Amino acid sequence: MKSVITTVVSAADAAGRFPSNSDLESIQGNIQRSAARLEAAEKLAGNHEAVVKEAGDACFAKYAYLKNPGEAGENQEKINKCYRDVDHYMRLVNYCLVVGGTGPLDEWGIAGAREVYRTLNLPTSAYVASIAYTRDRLCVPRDMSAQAGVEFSAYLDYLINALS
């Protein structure tokens, strides 16, 4: 995973040196920032079935053409796999707030995604419209705190810029 620990360890392994004073100074940033990004990861892990299903039909409220014949939301299995694939992405954002970097989103959600959503003909602007709906649904004092919403939205538009 790309993290704060695994970045400064790999940088000091390619150079072949011990953990320096600047490599311990980065893990102190992991301490002072963990309060905000673990509040967002706990708020998400408790209310995830209601956040996923609210965003799963924000895809079909913008793109009603997906129920046409031959499309990706024809039958019951294809919308079960669609609400699954959104719930997969919201699990990986919960994993990124815990680890502290874009590690689990890169290796498990983004790498290889352009070649799968084109081979199977899933419109990648509809794997985005559910992610973009959640980013604007968030009320900054209501669901989480101020800096917990900064961390929650910054991993939410990393995924948007990686699908676009």
Partner 1 sequence: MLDAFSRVVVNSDAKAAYVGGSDLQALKSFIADGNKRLDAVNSIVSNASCMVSDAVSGMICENPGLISPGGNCYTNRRMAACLRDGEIILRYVSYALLAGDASVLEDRCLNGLKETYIALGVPTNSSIRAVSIMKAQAVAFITNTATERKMSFAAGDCTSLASEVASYFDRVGAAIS
Partner 2 sequence: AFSSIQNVLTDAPLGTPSAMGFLDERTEKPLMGPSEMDELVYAVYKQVFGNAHIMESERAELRDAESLFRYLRDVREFVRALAKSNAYTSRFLQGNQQYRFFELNFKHLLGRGPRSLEEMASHSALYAEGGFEAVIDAILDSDEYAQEFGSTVVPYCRFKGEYPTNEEFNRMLVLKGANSTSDKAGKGRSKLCYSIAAGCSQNWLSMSKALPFGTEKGTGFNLISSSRNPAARPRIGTKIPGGVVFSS
Partner 3 sequence: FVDYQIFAPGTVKVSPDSVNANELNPVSGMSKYIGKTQKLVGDQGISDRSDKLPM
- Which residues ranging from 82 to 101 are in contact with partner 1 (CB under 8 A)? 91, 94-95, 98-100
For 110, which DSSP code?
I
> Pattern 44-83, binding to a second copy, x per CB under 8 A?
----------------------------------------
| CA dist list (Å): 160 to 26, 51, 68, 98, 127 | 27, 17, 26, 20, 9
Smallest gap from Cβ 99 to a second copy, in A, equals: 8
| Contact predicate 55/133, CB 8 Å | yes
User: Binding ligand PEB by CB under 6 A: which of 2, 33, 38, 163?
Assistant: 33
Give the integer Cα–Cα distance in Å for 134 and 157: 10
Residue from 76, 88, 79, 61 nearest 122 by CA? 79
Q: Is 2 exposed, middle or buried (0-12, 13-18, 19+ CB in 10 A)?
A: middle
Give the integer Cα–Cα distance in Å for 39 and 144: 7
Annotated binding-site residues for (2R,3E)-phycocyanobilin read 82
Using CB under 6 A, list all residues that contact ligand PEB.
Answer: 21, 24-25, 28, 33, 43-44, 47, 50-51, 54, 59, 66, 72-73, 78, 81-82, 85-86, 88-89, 108-109, 116, 120, 122-123, 126-127, 130, 134, 137-139, 141-143, 147, 150
Using CB under 8 A, list all residues that contact partner 2.
Answer: 1-2, 10, 14-16, 65, 68-71, 103, 106-107, 111-112, 114-115, 121
